[PDB]
Design a protein around this nucleic acid. Structure first.
Ligand SMILES: O=C(c1ccc(-n2nnc3cccnc32)cc1)N(c1ncccc1Cl)[C@@H]1CCCNC1
Ligand SMILES: [Mg+2]
Ligand SMILES: [Mg+2]
Ligand SMILES: [Mg+2]
Ligand SMILES: [Mg+2]
Ligand SMILES: [Mg+2]
Ligand SMILES: [Mg+2]
Ligand SMILES: [Mg+2]
Ligand SMILES: [Mg+2]
Ligand SMILES: [Mg+2]
Ligand SMILES: [Zn+2]
Lengths: 58, 84, 134, 122, 104, 103, 135, 26, 50
RNA sequence: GUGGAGCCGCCGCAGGUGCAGAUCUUGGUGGUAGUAGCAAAUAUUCAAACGAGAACUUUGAAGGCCGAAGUGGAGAAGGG
RNA sequence: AAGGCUAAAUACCGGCACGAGACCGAUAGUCAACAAGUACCGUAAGGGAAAGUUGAAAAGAACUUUGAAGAGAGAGUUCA
RNA sequence: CGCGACCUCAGAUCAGACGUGGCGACCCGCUGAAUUUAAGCAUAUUAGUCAGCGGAGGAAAAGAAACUAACCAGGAUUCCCUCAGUAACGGCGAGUGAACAGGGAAGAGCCCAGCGCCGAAUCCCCGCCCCGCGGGGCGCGGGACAUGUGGCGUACGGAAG
RNA sequence: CGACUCUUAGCGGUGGAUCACUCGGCUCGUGCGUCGAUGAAGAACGCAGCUAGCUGCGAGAAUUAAUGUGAAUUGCAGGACACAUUGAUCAUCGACACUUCGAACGCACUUGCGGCCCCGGGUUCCUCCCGGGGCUACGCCUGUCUGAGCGUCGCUU
């Protein structure tokens, strides 16, 4: 994801969980050099990253 | 020695940018800015630089709140809502 | 002669407000005369032009005897476009050449709720002036 | 499907928030449609749904703040963002009452010797 | 002229350096870096003896000459040689001090 | 620096006199301004006489000017005694009062 | 008095301004007391002050202050002149009793170095060039 | 493309002093 | 430096986004006179100065 | 002849009133001149490929240099 | 006298809105008629430009042909 | 030992208010040169100006005589024309330099401490209500201020009884 | 003869003078004369479907509401034409909103570390456990609460 830079990994862990109805294992974040915060949300082993991707749009 | 070889040892910066005026004039050891004088409460302006005033007079910025005071002036500072 | 000390007379300050006008002043300034059938009937001299009024051009390369509706009103370029007057490019794609609404005669208006009220107000303001002539 | 402001002022608080949280879903899945390849008819929808989302928030804030001024009406000590903000030098003038105070030595000086109207020809 | 046209740093180079001794702007970088500043020769400089707004604009004429000139100007409006030799075609007009009644 | 027969002059221009110059360009516009302030005041005190109270007869002090008669500041508080009108009622009827004046 | 605040007593000018150590500071010491009493308390309006002591090194002044926004001062129109915003900081303009004694003002033949308003309003008006319009 | 960009001011600064010194006869 | 504070790289991101040409639909607008970005900065010739 | 929207005579009025020079100011252009020059640190060669086009690109082959206090491998400041 | 207040006439090269001119006309007039206190320069204080005009309307040169293209020869638009 | 009244003082994220900083053309308070002129240069001049520092306000400051005068006397302040380049200051050199008369613009006057009289007759804060908008006033009730002096009448032109 | 050079002219270049134009200055005059702790001026960063600057704005971000106006905006697409709904656009502007720094306010300025109170979910918590909110600068005034003194006393012991 691309996340607002005022968020931390506790807030991203609940924003992804409550908008998309899925569990989150861990999050990694990255201020990418054009200014914005990029989040790497790893889903739980119960869920699949692929079908969640297909239902969020891509 | 005096010229183009001692220019190569320019490696570590004297000034950084200021929090109050955004300048690159905040000296990292004197802890004071060279334009506004940041840890002083007042703004550093002088009458001996007539140009350096007009870079930072009121009017050279957004005037986010004096745009509105000049517009609220010409109707007398109303406080009710409106008539329909 | 101008007598009000709060309106200009200089070329530089009338040309500035004419090219930098707001878009609601700019419809008042893109007005157009009416025909003789229509100002004998609505007794009003001129109107601001709008989207579907039908027009015969009175000056220029295209003159007279072609009633045609207008189709687009560039206020930014002070120019109306009329459904019949067009121009072939080199490409072969014909496009509308644009003309100025003071070079334009409205021969039939478009009437809604508000265009009725404006014609009624612009008319009543004339017979008050005929009553000054005692 | 247009959202009008006066259409929303007669509504309840829980109806606005359902229709606010609605528009935040369609604002987000339109940003998904932008960040993918593109569906250009659905990229002019991204402005009529973020200016519609300002209308709901304004009606919420104006039914929150003008309901809050009814509460501190007739109360001493209302909060600072309910007091009038008319240009700090005016909040330090006296008032129309204290500026119209006269002392007793200047009350009898105005009723014993009041200003007369006159003229001088005959 | 609005103020000084001297709102510009400029000192001469003075010494040798093979250029004329007009003051030069300071610094570097920009085009306006060694150009000749103020003096009535220079692009961007100051004009010779700038006009002042306290030039004497208004003149006195004493009153018995103003009245002399306005008795001399009515009397020449009553001679047909003088009033036609200024341009006014008064050829078809009647009696030359044209008066009309007070109804007008 | 001088020359043949002329005056020996002391011009007082050895000081920065160009920042302190006064140009009377507004002096038409201040004459019509203080006319309007007389007119808008004359109808504000509408029945009362313009130019205010009655002033006293006053002889000018010096050897140069003691042959002439001038308007004064006000009446001496003994005229109002002898003419018989009160001093706090004199100025409200239109009579200028000067309490520091001796006759 | 004041010592001229100049490093090592060297003033660098013509000899008439070598005056390091005999100079007197033309404002009085009571006006210095009224000022830094009113400089510390900025929300207070200073009326005036008086004398209560001196020893050899120190001089003591009681400075009387007025709180303009108290409702015993904001009411009572005998005192409402000082709660009006032109009476802010009367010592930094020299408007108290101790302040205006240094300004040299007064009516009389001893005091027309300030004959319009103040010393530098008399100065500007005699040293301006009043070249009229018809001149 | 096509339309490029401006370069920089020359900003020349003087240097040498009458070549290699030299003093006249005394 | 690869050791930088957060104010520096939210300054270097702003200077990196406006180092960008004009879009080619914008010279077709009515009455304008900009024709290329003259405020472009190359990383060798012009340097930001911190 | 080019040019495409303003202009002049006379009687008075008023000036920021006429250039060859000031190592003048700014802008433009010469001659010098297709000249000086593109010479510090040993070195290039054959074939091929892609291409409108190859002394310089790439790839293979040969011949060389640096020679581990490096023309190698990573960093700090600085850059962005 | 050593305590106090006080309107008006007066000042105003900053601000908000104006009206005018025997003023200047893009090397002139503000440094700035234009994305100007900008580009750029200096560690900094600070220094600081250049740069107006197609046409009535883009009608801004389709298509053919030479060349890899830039560039031409035609054709076309326009009072030009 | 303790209790209490005060007097001098401290603490609080105490209840409620206020001050800070910007602009600074004009205004007020300070502080303050040297270039320059004198054909040199020191006092002088520049100049109580530039630069520095602090305060304001739509104007500001000044302002109702511890005045001017010297005669048939004028009568707060500010501003203008004159006085006047004058009296005066000055290596009496270079230079500097007011005021009162007079004519106008505007015009407006007042207050307290003290002195005594009046049962502190005065003020602040909180509680609820008569009545209220867009909230501040008289009233009802305690907690304070205050006799080390609040309020009334009182001001040198006189005042009180 | 052919080149080279020289001087005139015709044409083409190179160059941007001249003249014509002017939404800019400049000067004079007039009316007004208004910033801020309820967060100013100034600075930083962010905001457009395609957007770098300028200009306009502030996470409601190239603007919301309200009133006036009455069909456009426009470089190209897209979508609402409904306007006897609330109506495009523009102006106005009184209602709402207004990120961080800055007098700049918890302490620091390294987006560093807190301290109390309340609300949601975990140990149903008091004892340094995620998120949200509120409070926490200095000087100073009137009052209140707490109480220091071999300060001045009073009654008591
Ligand atoms: O570099 C120079 C140098 C030589 C001439 C000029 N000139 N001469 N006329 C001139 C006109 C304009 C400008 N510059 C000019 C400038 C510098 N050097 C030098 N040589 C000899 C005496 C003094 C010096 Cl400093 C160095 C010294 C070290 C060894 N390498 C040579
Ligand atoms: Mg501090
Ligand atoms: Mg003009
Ligand atoms: Mg020195
Ligand atoms: Mg004369
Ligand atoms: Mg040019
Ligand atoms: Mg030619
Ligand atoms: Mg103000
Ligand atoms: Mg709106
Ligand atoms: Mg919190
Ligand atoms: Zn700074």
């Amino acid at each position: 994801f691309i996340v607002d830079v005022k968020a931390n990994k506790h807030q991203i862990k609940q924003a992804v969980k409550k908008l998309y109805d899925i569990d989150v294992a861990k999050v990694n974040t990255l201020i990418r050099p054009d200014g914005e915060k990029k989040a790497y949300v790893r889903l739980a082993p119960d869920y699949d990253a692929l079908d969640v991707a297909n239902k969020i749009g891509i | 020695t005096k010229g183009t070889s001692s220019f190569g040892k320019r490696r570590n910066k004297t000034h950084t940018l200021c929090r109050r005026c955004g300048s690159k004039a905040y000296h990292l050891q004197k802890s004071t800015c060279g334009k506004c004088g940041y840890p002083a409460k007042r703004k550093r302006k002088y009458n001996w630089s007539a140009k350096a005033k007009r870079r930072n007079t009121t009017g050279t910025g957004r005037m986010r709140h004096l745009k509105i005071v000049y517009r609220r002036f010409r109707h007398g500072f109303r406080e009710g809502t409106t008539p329909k | 002669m101008k007598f009000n000390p709060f309106v200009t007379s200089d070329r530089s300050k009338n040309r500035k407000r004419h090219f930098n006008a707001p878009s609601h002043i700019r419809r008042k300034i893109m007005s157009s005369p009416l025909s003789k059938e229509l100002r004998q009937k609505y007794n009003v001299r001129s109107m601001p032009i709008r989207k579907d009024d039908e027009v015969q051009v009175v000056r220029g390369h295209y003159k007279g005897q072609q009633i045609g509706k207008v189709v687009q009103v560039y206020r930014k370029k002070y120019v109306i476009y009329i459904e019949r007057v067009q121009r072939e490019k080199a490409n072969g794609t014909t496009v509308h050449v644009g003309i100025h609404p003071s070079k334009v005669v409205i021969t039939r208006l478009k009437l809604d709720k508000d265009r009725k009220k404006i014609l009624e107000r612009k008319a009543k303001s004339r017979q008050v002036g005929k009553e000054k002539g005692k | 499907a247009k959202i009008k402001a006066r259409d929303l002022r007669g509504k309840k608080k829980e109806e606005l928030l359902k229709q606010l949280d609605d528009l935040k879903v369609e604002l987000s899945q339109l940003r998904v449609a932008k960040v993918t390849g593109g569906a250009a008819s659905k990229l002019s929808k991204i402005r009529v749904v973020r200016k519609s989302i300002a209308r709901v928030l304004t009606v919420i804030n104006q039914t929150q703040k003008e309901n809050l001024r009814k509460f501190y009406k007739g109360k001493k000590y209302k909060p600072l963002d309910l007091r009038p903000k008319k240009t700090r030098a005016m909040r330090r003038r006296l008032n129309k009452h204290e500026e119209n105070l006269k002392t007793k030595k200047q009350q009898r000086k105005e009723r014993l010797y009041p200003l007369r109207k006159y003229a001088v020809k005959a | 002229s609005e103020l000084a046209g001297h709102q510009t740093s400029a000192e001469s180079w003075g010494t040798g350096r093979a250029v004329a001794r007009i003051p030069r702007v300071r610094g570097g970088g920009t085009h306006r870096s060694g150009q000749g500043a103020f003096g009535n020769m220079c692009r961007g400089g100051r004009m010779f003896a700038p006009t002042k707004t306290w030039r004497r604009w208004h003149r006195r004429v004493n009153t018995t000459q103003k009245r002399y000139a306005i008795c001399s100007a009515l009397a020449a409006s009553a001679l047909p040689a003088l009033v036609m030799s200024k341009g006014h075609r008064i050829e078809e007009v009647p009696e030359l001090p044209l008066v009309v009644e007070d109804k007008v | 620096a001088p020359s043949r027969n002329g005056m020996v002059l002391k011009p007082h221009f050895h000081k920065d006199w160009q920042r302190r110059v006064a140009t009377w360009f507004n002096q038409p516009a201040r004459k019509i301004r203080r006319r309007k302030a007389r007119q808008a005041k004359a109808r504000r005190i509408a029945p009362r006489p313009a130019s205010g109270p009655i002033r006293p007869i006053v002889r000018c002090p010096t050897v140069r000017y003691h042959t002439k008669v001038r308007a004064g500041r006000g009446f001496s508080l003994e005229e109002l005694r002898v003419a018989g009108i009160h001093k706090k009622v004199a100025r409200t009827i239109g009579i200028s009062v000067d309490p520091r004046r001796r006759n | 008095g004041r010592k001229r605040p100049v490093p090592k007593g060297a003033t660098y000018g013509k000899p008439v301004h070598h005056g390091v150590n005999q100079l007197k500071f033309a404002r009085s010491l009571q006006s210095v007391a009224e000022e830094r009493a009113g400089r510390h308390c900025g929300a207070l309006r200073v009326l005036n002050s008086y004398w209560v002591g001196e020893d050899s090194t120190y001089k003591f002044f009681e400075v009387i202050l007025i709180d303009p926004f108290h409702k015993a001062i904001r009411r009572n129109p005998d005192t409402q002149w000082i709660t009006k915003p032109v009476h802010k900081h009367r010592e930094m303009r020299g408007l108290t009793s101790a302040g205006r004694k240094s300004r040299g003002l007064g009516k009389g033949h001893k005091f027309h170095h300030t004959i319009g308003g103040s010393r530098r309003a008399a100065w500007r008006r005699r040293n301006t060039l009043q070249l009229h319009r018809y001149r | 493309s096509w339309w490029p960009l401006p370069l920089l001011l020359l900003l020349l600064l003087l240097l040498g002093p009458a070549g290699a010194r030299a003093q006249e006869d005394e | 430096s690869s050791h930088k504070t957060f104010r520096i790289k939210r300054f270097l991101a702003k200077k990196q986004k406006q180092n960008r040409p004009i879009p080619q639909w914008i010279r077709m607008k009515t009455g304008n006179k900009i024709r290329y970005n003259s405020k472009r900065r190359h990383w060798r010739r012009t340097k930001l100065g911190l």
